[PDB]
From a paper:
The Ser/Thr protein kinase Tor is a hub for cellular homeostatic regulation. While some yeast species such as Saccharomyces cerevisiae have two genes that encode Tor1 and Tor2 proteins, mammalian cells have a single gene encoding mTOR910. Both Tor and mTOR occur in two complexes known as TORC1 and TORC2. Lst8 is a requisite component for both TORC1 and TORC2.
Focusing on the heterodimer that forms the core of both TORC1 and TORC2, we have determined a 6 Å resolution structure of the full-length Tor–Lst8 complex from the thermotolerant yeast Kluyveromyces marxianus (KmTor). Our structure shows that KmTor–Lst8 forms a dimer of heterodimers, in which the two KmTor subunits embrace each other with their helical solenoids. The Fourier shell correlation plot suggests that the overall resolution of the structure is ∼6 Å, with the highest local resolution (5 Å) corresponding to the FATKIN and the N- and C-terminal regions of the α-solenoid that contact the FATKIN. The structure of each monomer shows an extensive N-terminal helical solenoid with a complex topology that precedes the FATKIN. The N-terminus of KmTor forms a highly curved spiral consisting of about 800 residues arranged into 36 helices (residues 64–837). The spiral is followed by a linker (residues 838–894) that runs along the surface of the FATKIN to connect the spiral to a region that we will refer to as the 'bridge' (residues 895–1169). The bridge is followed by a 32-residue linker that we refer to as the ‘railing' (residues 1170–1201) that folds back and runs over the entire length of the bridge, ending in several helices (Nα52–Nα56) that form a 'cap' (residues 1202–1292), which packs between the N-terminal end of the bridge and the TRD1 of the FATKIN. The largest interface between the two KmTor subunits occurs at the periphery of the dimer and involves a region of the spiral (helices Nα25, Nα27 and Nα29) of one molecule contacting the bridge (helices N\α44, N\α46, N\α48 and N\α50) of the other molecule. The second, smaller interface consists of the HRD domain of one Tor interacting with the HRD of the other, via three helices (α24, α26 and α28) making intermolecular contacts at the center of the dimer.
Author numbering:
A (entry chain D): 3 to 301
B (entry chain A): 1245 to 1265, 1274 to 1289, 1299 to 1405, 1412 to 1441, 1444 to 1515, 1520 to 1531
C (entry chain A): 785 to 815, 825 to 836, 841 to 866, 884 to 891, 897 to 914, 918 to 935, 942 to 955, 958 to 992, ...
D (entry chain A): 1590 to 1618, 1631 to 1669, 1687 to 1767, 1783 to 1813, 1815 to 2448
C-alpha cells in the first residue's frame, strides 16, 4: 500500500502507509507528472509532464531510471498498464493514442482521435478497450490488434476529459468539461458493450475532473478544480454521498485504494487532505509538492 | 493679482498636493468646501486632483456629482457603479445614461443586469420597453400605471383599438389627467374620431404642447383658423424655448417640432 | 418669411445648412418671438454630419486643445509638474500687462536658477523702453545657460534696435 | 400613394408591427407598386409560389397592358416588372440555381435585364446576376474541369458558349461600372475576364467595353492588376497589358508605384514585361518617371544597413552550416554575401566605412573561399573563425548602429532635396499631389529583429509623412489589406444608421518596396497596446508582468501545463489580477472627461470593426504588440496582418483561435458590461456585412485573396509552405513517380509549383468555404445561418472561452 502524489512542484515523494509522510526521491522535475501510475507488481512507475513518459521504479527506492518511454507528443493524459503489465496502454495529448507497452518498455499502438487522447482504457477483457478523447465519441481499441472503434458519444460538444472504465463488465462512466458526468450501462461483453446511458450527473457542476467508481463501485467520486467535490453512492442511482472537503485545489486524483473508508485526495493547496471515505476526516493531510498538486498512486 | 482663475485652480492643485505632501485640517476644510454649494469650477478642480491621485470622499464625490447635474458626472457615478453591484445605483446609472442619451449601450448593460445580477422590476420594464423589448412582457406583467406604460407601448405599437381599451381605462380612471392626455392623444391619432379627441383635449392640460397641436388640430378638424393660429404661435413659442435650451440629441426632436 | 415663400418654391439644404446652423445658433442667440417665428418657419443625420464638416472648417485645433489644456501638461505629465507649472505661467504670460510678464520672467529664471526657456526666448522676442531694460536684465539672467538656438534670435532682437549697449555687451560676455 | 407607398417600403425596412400594419392599411388604401408591396409583405410571409404566382400574374398583366401618364406609369411599372422577375428569381434561387434551373433563372434575369433601361444598377447586380451565371457556368466549367477525367477548358466553355453567355454579362459588367458592385464587382468581373480567356468574342467585346468605360475605374485594383504579371497567353492579354500601360499612362504618376515595385522585384519574363511598361513610363512624361525611378531606387538604397544585413544574415548562414552541416548550401548564401561583398564599399561611409572590416573579412572570406573550395577543412575553419570575430565586431557596431543618418551612410538619399511627385503614398486620385521637402538625413532606426528604421519625410505640403523600413514583408498583402478595409469602409459609407453610428477603419498607407521589403509609416499619434500598457502599468509602479509573475508563482511552467493545470492557473492568476488599469488609461486619456465617454464609444466601435474584420479575415495577431490604439481621442490600431488563415491552423506554437482578442477586464471595463451592446452593435454591423456584399463583394475580396505569386505568396506563408511541408507524400504517383521514370522531371520540371499552387487554390477554396460558413453563415457543430443573434453569440462565446483561447502562448498576453 505504497502511497505518493505528484505536484507542479515537479518533485514527488512516497507517503508512508498511515503516516502520509512523504519520503522518496521522485522528480517530475524538468516537468510535472500528468497521471500517476505504478506497475502491476509495482515495479516501475511512469508519468509525463511534457512530451515524454518517464518511469522511476516503484519497486526500487527512488530509482531515477526505471524506464523512459517516448510517445505521441504531449503530456500523456492517461495510460493503462495491463494485468500482463507487458502490453500496456497509453494515451497522449498528441491527438492520437499511442500506447507504450511495457514490452521492452516497447511501444506500438495507433489510435487516432479528433483531439488529444484523453485516457488509455481497458474493457471487462483487459485485452479489450475503447478510446474517448477530449473531442468526442469513444473509440473501441483491442490489444495490439483488431483496434478501430465503436463510437460512443455522451455529448456532441463537451470535451471528454478521459475514457473511464473500471472493472464491472457492465458499466460506463466518465468525467469532462461538463461537470455533470455522463455515465451509461454497458452490456456483458469482452468488449461489445452497447451502452445504456445512466445520466449526466453534476456533483460539482463546474469542470468535474477526476471520475472514479468505488472499489466495489457501490460508490462513486467526482473531483473538480473548482475546489468542489461530492461523492455519490453508485450503488443506488449514483445517489450523491460525500462532499469532499478541500481547499482551493485541483484534484485530478480522487480515490480510496485499500480503504473505501478513508478518502485520499488531491490538493493544489500543496497539502493534500485525505478524508474518510466512510464519512470524512483529515487523514495525514499534507503534500510533497511545495506548490501544490493533482495526482496520487497506490502500491 | 492679474487674477487668473485657471491659473489658480491648477496651482491650487499643486498646493493641494503640498498639503497632500495631517491635513486633517485640509481634510475637513475641503470637505465642507465641497459642502458649500463657481460650484462646478472647484468641482472640476477636485476632479483634476482625483485624476492626479485620489482625494477620496468617494460617494461624497458621487453625491456632489449628482448635485452638479451636468451629466459629465455620469462618468464619476460610472466609476461608482463600477465599484460595486448596486442594482439601485445600477438603475441610477441607467437613467443617468438615459440623460446622457448614450443609453443604447447602457440598455445593453441593463439587459445584462437582468441577465447578470438578479433583475429589477420597474425601471427594468420601463427601459426594456425603451428597448424594443418588454412589450408583450409589460402586457402580461400588467395583465399579471405600468399598464399606462404598456399603453404607451401600444401607442408605440399599432392597434388604436387597443388604445380604445386604454381609453376605456381612461373613462374608468380620469395623473389621471396626464395619463389620459398622452393616451387619448395616441387614440385620436389612431382613431380619426373627432369626438373622443374632443374628450381627450378637453381632459388634457393648461400647458399642453401636444394638445395645443390637438387644439389647432380640432380647429382645423372643422373650420377655425383663429384658435388654431393661437395654438400655432403659442406652442411655437413653447418649443422655441425648448430648443432654446439646446444634433446630437434634439435634431430629430426639434425636427419634429418644425 | 422670404425663405418661407422660397420654400414654397423649393427645398434648401446646400450651403444654407451651415448657415441655418449658424442661424439656428443665431436663433438661439438672438432669441421677441422674432427668432421664434423664424425657426418656426425654418421648415437630419446626413445634413448634421455635413454641417459638422463645414463647422470643422469654421473652427478647429487650438480651442479644442485649449479645452484640452497645462491640465494638458499634467495629462502628458514632481520636477516635471513644477516645470509644467512654469510653462503654464509662461503660457498665460505670452498670452496684456507687460511688466507682469517682466517680473514673471525675472523670478522665472531666478527659480530656474530649459526648453520652456527656449520657448520663452521667442516670448521675450515678442517684446516702451522699460521693456528693453527689463528684457536686457532678463538676457543677463539668460547668461546662466548656453545657447545653442537662442543665439540667432538673440542677434535678431539685438538688431532692433541697436543704452542696451551694456546689455548686448553682456550678451557677448555670455557668449 | 407612392408617398404612402414609400411609407410602406419604410414599414418593410421597419420592424414587423408597423410593417404588416401599414401593409394592410395601404393595401386597403395601377397599384403595381402596391402589388410589389403586398408582394414584399408576402416575402415577409415567405410563401414561395404565392409570390411566384402573383409575380407572374402581374407580369402577364403588364404584358397584356403594354403588349410586346399611364404610359410612363407603365415605364416605371416595367422597371418594377423586370425587378420583380429578378426578385422572385433570387427568392427561388435560394432553393436553387445550382446548375439546372439557374439557366432559365438567368434567362429571366437577362429577360428582366433585356427589359430594363433601368434601376439596372440594380440589374447591374443582375448583370452581375448574369455574370454569376457566367460564374456558376464557370463553376460548371469548374465542375467540368474538376471532373475532366488552356485550350481544353477553352473549348469546353466554348461551343455554346458559356463564354458567349459570359461576354454579354461582361459588357453589361462594364455597363455596371457605368451604373455605380462598384469597384468590387468591377475588379471581380475584370479578373474574371482576364482569366476567362483572350478569345475572339472576348477579345473584341472586352476591347470595346474596357475601351468604352473609364480609366480611374481601372485605377483601383492596380495592385491586383500587377497581380497579373506574366500572361501565359500573351494573346489579347498581351494587348490587355497594353491596355494596362495605357490606362497607366493616364495619371501614371498619380500612382506609378506598382510600376516601380514590379520593376524592383524580379518577375523575369514578367519583369521584362515590367521593363516594357517601364518604357511606357519612360515614355509618357518620362521625366517624372526618371525622378521617381531615382526615388524608389534610393529607397531600396537605404534598405538595410548593408554590411550589417550581410553580417546577421551570414550569422544565420553559419548557423545553418554548423548546424546539420549545411555548409556549401549555406555557403551558397555566403556566396551571395560574397556577391554583397562583390558590390564593394559602395555607399558613403557605410559600405565605405565597412570596407576595412569587410575588406579583412573579405580576405578571410577569400581565404574561406579558397580552401573550402579546395575540399573542406582549412577554410572551413577560417570561415567560421573570421565570421565569429566579424560577428563580434559587427555585434558591437550593431549596438552602435542604433543611430541612423543618410549622409554618413548613403548620402545619395540626402542628395535629393526635392522631387516633383512625392505624395508618399498619399495617392489621392484627385489631389494636390505633394512634392517633398524630404527630411533630415538622420533617421530613426527601429529596434527589432528587423530593426525597421523609420523617418517622417517633410513634403511640399509641409506634412512629414512617416515612412518605415520593412524587412521581408508584403505591403502588397497589406495593400490588399487596406484595400479590403476600403471595401469595408465602403460598406460603412454604404451603411444604415450604423453609418450614423459610423466608425470606419483608418487605413495606414504603406508602400511596398522590394520583392521582400516595404515602406511603412508611423501612424497618427498612437499607443501600441503592449507598449502603452507596459508603460502605464509600470508607471503604475508595479511589475510589468504580473502575468509571468503570477504564472511562475503558480507553478514552474505553462509549457507543460495541461488543460486543467493551465485552466486553474489562469483562473487563479486572473483572480489575483484585473484589467482596470486599462480603463484607468482611458481615465488617463479621459481629459475633459467627455473624452472618457466618447473615446469609450470610440474604442468600443474600434473593437467592433476589428472583430468583424478578423473574424472575416482571420489574421488575429494576438500580440498586444500587434495590438495598438491611438494617442489621439483614439481608435484601435490592428496592424501588420500576417494572413487570412488561422494562426492556430498555422501553429505550430499554441492553439489560438478566437474571432476577436480581448484583454478581459480591459474590454469589459472599457464600457459597462463588456461589449454587451458594443459587441451587439458589432453584431449589427457584422450582420450588415453578413448580408450586404456578403455574397458579391465578400466573394470578390475573397478572389482578391485568391490568385497568384505575390498573393499566392501571402497565402503560401499563410500555410506556410513550411507547414505545407512533407507528407507521404505523393498525391498518388509523385513519390514513385520521382523514380527512374525521371530524369524527365529535370527535363520537364514546371510543376512542381502548379501542384503547390493547386494546393493554394485548395486552401483558398477552403478559405472561402470558411467565409460562407463565416458569412451568413455557419460554424460549429450546428449551423443554420445562425444569423445575427447566434453567429454573434457563438462569436461572443469564442471570445469568452477559453483558457483554450488563453492557451495562446506568450502572444495572448493575458
Amino acid at each position: 500500500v505504497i502511497l505518493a502524489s505528484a505536484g507542479y512542484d515537479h518533485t514527488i515523494r512516497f507517503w508512508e502507509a498511515l503516516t502520509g509522510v512523504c519520503s522518496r526521491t521522485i522528480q517530475h522535475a524538468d516537468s510535472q507528472v500528468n497521471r500517476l501510475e505504478i506497475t502491476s507488481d509495482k515495479k516501475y512507475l511512469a508519468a509525463a509532464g511534457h512530451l515524454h513518459v518517464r518511469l522511476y521504479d516503484i519497486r526500487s527506492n527512488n530509482p531515477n531510471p526505471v524506464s523512459s518511454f517516448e510517445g505521441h507528443k504531449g503530456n500523456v493524459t492517461s495510460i493503462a498498464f495491463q494485468q500482463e503489465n507487458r502490453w500496456m496502454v497509453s494515451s497522449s495529448e498528441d491527438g492520437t493514442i499511442k500506447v507504450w507497452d511495457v514490452r521492452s518498455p516497447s511501444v506500438q499502438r495507433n489510435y487516432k482521435h479528433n483531439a488529444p487522447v484523453n485516457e488509455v482504457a481497458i474493457h471487462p477483457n483487459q485485452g479489450e478497450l475503447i478510446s474517448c478523447d477530449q473531442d468526442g465519441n469513444i473509440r473501441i481499441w483491442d490489444l495490439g490488434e483488431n483496434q478501430c472503434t465503436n463510437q460512443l458519444t455522451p455529448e456532441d460538444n463537451t470535451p471528454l476529459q478521459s475514457l473511464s472504465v473500471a472493472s464491472d463488465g457492465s458499466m460506463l462512466v466518465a468525467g469532462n468539461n461538463k461537470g455533470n458526468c455522463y455515465v451509461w450501462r454497458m452490456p456483458h461483453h469482452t468488449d461489445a458493450s452497447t451502452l445504456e446511458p445512466v445520466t449526466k450527473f453534476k456533483s460539482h457542476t463546474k469542470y468535474i475532473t477526476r471520475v472514479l467508481l468505488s472499489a466495489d463501485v457501490k460508490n462513486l467520486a467526482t473531483c473538480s478544480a473548482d475546489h468542489t467535490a461530492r461523492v455519490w453512492n453508485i450503488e443506488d442511482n449514483y445517489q450523491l454521498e460525500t462532499t469532499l472537503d478541500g481547499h482551493q485545489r485541483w484534484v485530478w486524483d480522487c480515490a480510496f485504494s485499500a480503504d473505501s473508508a478513508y478518502l485520499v485526495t488531491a490538493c493544489s493547496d500543496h497539502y493534500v487532505r485525505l478524508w474518510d471515505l466512510s464519512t470524512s476526516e483529515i487523514v495525514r493531510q499534507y503534500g510533497g509538492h511545495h506548490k501544490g498538486a493533482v495526482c496520487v498512486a497506490l502500491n | 493679482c492679474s487674477g487668473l482663475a485657471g491659473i489658480y485652480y491648477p496651482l491650487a492643485r499643486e498646493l493641494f498636493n503640498a498639503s497632500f505632501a495631517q491635513y486633517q485640517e485640509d481634510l475637513i476644510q475641503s470637505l465642507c468646501a465641497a459642502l458649500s454649494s463657481t460650484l462646478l469650477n472647484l468641482v472640476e478642480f477636485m476632479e483634476h486632483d482625483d485624476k492626479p491621485l485620489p482625494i477620496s470622499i468617494s460617494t461624497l464625490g458621487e453625491y456632489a456629482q449628482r448635485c452638479h447635474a451636468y451629466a459629465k458626472a455620469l462618468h464619476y457615478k460610472e466609476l461608482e457603479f463600477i465599484e460595486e453591484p448596486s442594482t439601485s445605483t445600477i438603475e441610477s446609472l441607467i437613467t443617468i445614461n438615459n440623460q446622457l442619451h448614450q443609453t443604447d449601450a447602457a440598455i445593453g448593460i441593463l439587459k445584462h443586469a437582468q441577465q447578470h445580477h438578479d433583475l429589477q422590476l420597474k425601471e427594468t420594464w420601463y427601459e426594456k420597453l425603451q428597448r424594443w423589448d418588454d412589450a408583450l412582457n409589460a402586457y402580461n406583467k400588467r395583465e399579471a400605471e405600468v399598464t399606462i406604460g404598456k399603453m404607451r407601448s401600444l401607442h408605440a405599437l399599432g392597434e388604436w383599438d387597443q388604445l380604445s381599451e386604454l381609453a376605456a381605462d381612461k373613462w374608468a380612471s380620469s395623473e389621471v389627467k396626464r395619463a389620459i392626455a398622452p393616451l387619448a392623444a395616441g387614440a385620436a391619432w389612431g382613431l380619426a374620431q373627432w369626438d373622443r379627441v374632443e374628450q381627450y383635449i378637453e381632459v388634457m392640460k393648461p400647458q399642453s404642447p401636444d394638445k395645443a397641436f390637438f387644439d389647432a388640430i380640432l380647429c382645423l378638424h372643422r373650420n377655425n383658423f383663429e384658435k388654431a393660429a393661437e395654438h400655432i404661435f403659442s406652442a411655437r413659442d413653447l418649443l422655441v424655448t425648448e430648443m432654446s435650451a439646446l444634433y446630437n440629441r434634439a435634431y430629430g426632436v426639434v425636427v419634429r417640432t418644425q | 418669411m422670404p425663405l418661407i415663400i422660397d420654400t414654397f418654391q423649393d427645398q434648401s439644404n446646400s450651403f444654407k445648412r451651415g448657415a441655418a446652423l449658424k442661424a439656428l445658433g443665431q436663433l438661439a442667440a438672438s432669441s421677441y418671438p422674432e427668432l421664434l417665428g423664424v425657426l418656426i418657419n425654418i421648415l437630419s443625420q446626413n445634413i448634421r454630419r455635413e454641417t459638422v464638416r463645414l463647422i470643422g472648417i469654421l473652427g478647429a485645433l487650438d480651442p479644442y486643445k485649449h479645452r484640452e489644456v497645462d491640465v494638458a501638461l499634467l495629462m502628458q505629465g514632481e520636477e516635471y509638474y513644477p516645470t509644467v507649472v512654469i510653462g503654464v505661467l509662461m503660457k498665460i504670460l505670452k498670452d496684456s500687462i507687460h511688466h507682469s510678464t517682466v517680473i514673471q520672467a525675472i523670478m522665472h529664471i531666478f527659480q530656474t536658477m530649459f526648453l520652456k526657456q527656449i520657448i520663452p526666448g521667442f516670448i521675450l522676442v515678442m517684446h516702451p523702453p522699460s521693456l528693453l531694460e527689463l528684457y536686457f536684465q532678463q538676457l543677463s539672467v539668460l547668461i546662466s545657460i548656453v545657447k545653442q538656438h537662442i543665439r540667432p534670435h538673440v542677434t535678431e532682437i539685438v538688431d532692433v534696435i541697436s543704452l542696451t549697449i551694456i546689455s548686448v555687451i553682456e550678451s557677448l560676455s555670455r557668449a | 400613394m407612392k408617398v404612402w407607398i414609400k411609407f410602406a417600403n419604410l414599414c418593410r425596412k421597419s420592424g414587423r408591427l408597423g410593417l404588416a400594419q401599414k401593409t394592410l392599411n395601404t393595401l386597403l388604401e395601377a397599384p403595381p407598386p402596391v402589388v410589389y408591396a403586398q408582394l414584399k409583405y408576402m416575402w415577409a410571409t415567405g410563401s414561395q409560389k404565392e409570390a411566384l404566382n402573383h409575380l407572374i400574374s402581374f407580369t402577364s398583366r403588364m404584358a397584356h397592358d403594354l403588349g410586346l401618364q399611364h404610359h410612363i406609369e407603365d415605364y416605371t411599372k416595367l422597371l418594377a416588372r423586370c425587378f420583380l422577375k429578378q426578385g422572385e428569381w433570387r427568392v427561388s434561387l435560394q432553393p436553387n440555381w445550382r446548375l439546372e434551373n439557374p439557366d432559365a433563372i438567368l434567362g429571366s434575369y437577362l429577360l428582366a435585364t433585356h427589359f430594363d433601361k433601368t434601376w439596372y444598377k440594380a440589374w447591374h447586380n443582375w448583370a452581375l446576376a448574369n455574370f454569376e451565371v457566367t460564374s456558376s457556368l464557370t463553376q460548371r466549367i469548374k465542375d467540368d474541369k474538376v471532373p475532366p477525367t488552356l485550350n481544353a477548358n477553352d473549348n469546353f466553355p466554348p461551343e455554346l458558349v458559356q463564354r458567349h453567355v459570359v461576354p454579354a454579362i461582361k459588357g453589361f459588367f462594364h455597363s455596371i461600372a457605368l451604373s455605380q458592385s462598384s469597384l468590387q464587382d468591377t475588379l471581380r468581373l475584370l479578373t474574371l475576364w482576364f482569366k476567362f480567356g483572350g478569345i475572339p468574342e472576348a477579345a473584341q467585346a472586352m476591347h470595346e467595353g474596357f475601351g468604352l468605360i473609364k480609366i480611374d475605374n481601372w485605377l483601383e485594383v492596380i495592385p491586383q492588376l500587377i497581380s497579373r504579371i506574366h500572361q501565359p497567353n500573351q494573346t489579347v492579354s498581351r494587348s490587355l497589358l497594353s491596355l494596362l500601360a495605357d490606362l497607366g499612362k493616364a495619371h501614371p504618376q498619380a500612382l506609378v508605384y506598382p510600376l516601380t515595385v514590379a520593376i524592383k522585384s524580379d518577375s523575369v519574363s514578367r519583369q521584362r514585361a515590367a521593363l516594357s511598361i517601364i518604357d511606357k513610363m519612360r515614355m509618357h512624361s518620362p521625366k517624372l518617371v526618371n525622378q521617381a525611378e531615382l526615388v524608389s531606387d534610393e529607397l531600396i538604397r537605404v534598405a538595410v544597413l548593408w554590411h550589417e544585413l550581410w553580417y546577421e544574415g551570414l550569422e544565420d548562414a553559419s548557423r545553418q552550416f554548423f548546424g546539420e552541416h549545411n555548409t556549401e548550401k549555406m555557403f551558397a548564401t555566403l556566396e551571395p554575401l560574397h556577391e554583397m561583398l562583390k558590390r564593394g564599399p559602395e555607399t558613403l561611409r557605410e559600405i565605405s566605412f565597412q570596407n576595412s572590416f569587410g575588406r579583412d573579412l573579405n580576405d578571410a572570406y577569400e581565404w574561406v573561399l579558397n580552401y573550402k573550395r579546395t575540399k573542406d577543412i582549412n577554410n572551413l575553419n577560417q570561415a567560421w573563425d573570421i565570421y565569429y570575430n566579424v560577428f563580434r565586431r559587427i555585434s558591437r557596431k550593431l549596438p552602435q548602429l542604433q543611430t541612423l543618418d543618410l549622409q554618413h551612410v548613403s548620402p545619395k538619399l540626402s542628395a535629393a532635396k526635392d522631387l516633383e511627385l512625392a505624395v508618399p503614398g498619399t495617392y489621392h486620385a484627385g489631389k494636390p499631389i505633394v512634392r517633398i521637402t524630404h527630411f533630415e538625413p538622420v533617421f530613426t532606426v527601429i529596434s527589432s529583429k528587423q530593426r525597421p528604421r523609420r523617418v517622417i519625410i517633410k513634403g511640399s505640403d509641409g506634412k512629414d509623412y512617416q515612412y518605415l523600413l520593412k524587412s521581408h514583408e508584403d505591403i502588397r498583402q497589406d495593400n490588399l489589406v487596406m484595400q479590403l478595409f476600403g471595401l469595408v469602409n465602403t460598406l460603412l459609407q454604404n451603411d444604415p444608421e450604423s453609418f450614423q453610428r459610423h466608425l470606419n477603419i483608418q487605413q495606414y498607407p504603406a508602400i511596398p518596396l522590394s520583392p521582400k521589403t516595404g515602406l511603412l509609416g508611423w501612424v497618427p499619434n498612437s499607443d501600441t497596446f503592449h507598449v502603452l500598457i507596459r508603460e502605464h502599468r509600470e508607471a503604475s509602479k508595479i511589475p510589468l508582468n504580473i502575468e509571468h509573475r503570477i504564472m511562475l508563482q503558480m507553478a514552474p511552467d505553462y509549457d507543460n501545463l495541461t488543460l486543467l493545470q493551465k485552466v486553474e492557473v489562469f483562473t487563479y492568476a486572473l483572480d489575483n489580477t484585473k484589467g482596470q488599469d486599462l480603463y484607468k488609461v482611458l481615465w488617463l486619456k479621459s481629459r475633459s472627461s467627455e473624452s472618457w465617454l466618447d473615446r469609450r464609444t470610440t474604442y468600443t466601435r474600434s473593437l467592433a470593426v476589428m472583430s468583424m474584420v478578423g473574424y472575416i479575415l482571420g489574421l488575429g495577431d494576438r500580440h498586444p504588440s500587434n495590438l495598438m490604439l491611438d494617442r489621439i481621442t483614439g481608435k484601435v490600431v490592428h496592424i501588420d496582418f500576417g494572413d487570412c488563415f488561422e494562426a492556430a491552423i498555422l501553429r505550430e506554437k499554441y492553439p489560438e483561435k478566437v474571432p476577436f482578442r480581448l484583454t478581459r477586464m480591459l474590454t469589459y471595463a472599457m464600457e459597462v458590461s463588456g461589449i454587451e451592446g458594443s459587441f451587439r452593435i458589432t453584431c449589427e454591423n457584422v450582420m450588415m456585412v453578413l448580408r450586404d456584399n456578403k455574397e458579391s463583394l465578400m466573394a470578390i475580396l475573397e478572389a482578391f485573396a485568391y490568385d497568384p505569386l505575390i498573393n499566392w505568396g501571402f497565402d503560401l506563408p499563410t500555410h506556410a509552405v513550411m507547414e505545407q511541408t512533407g507528407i507521404d507524400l505523393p498525391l498518388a504517383n509523385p513519390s514513385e513517380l520521382l523514380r527512374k521514370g525521371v530524369i524527365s522531371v529535370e527535363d520537364a520540371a514546371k510543376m512542381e509549383l502548379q501542384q503547390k499552387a493547386e494546393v493554394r487554390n485548395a486552401r483558398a477554396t477552403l478559405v472561402l468555404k470558411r467565409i460562407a460558413d463565416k458569412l451568413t453563415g455557419n460554424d460549429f457543430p450546428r449551423c443554420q445561418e445562425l444569423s445575427v443573434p447566434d453567429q454573434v453569440d457563438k462569436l461572443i462565446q469564442q471570445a469568452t472561452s477559453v483558457e483554450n483561447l488563453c492557451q495562446h502562448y506568450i502572444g495572448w498576453c493575458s
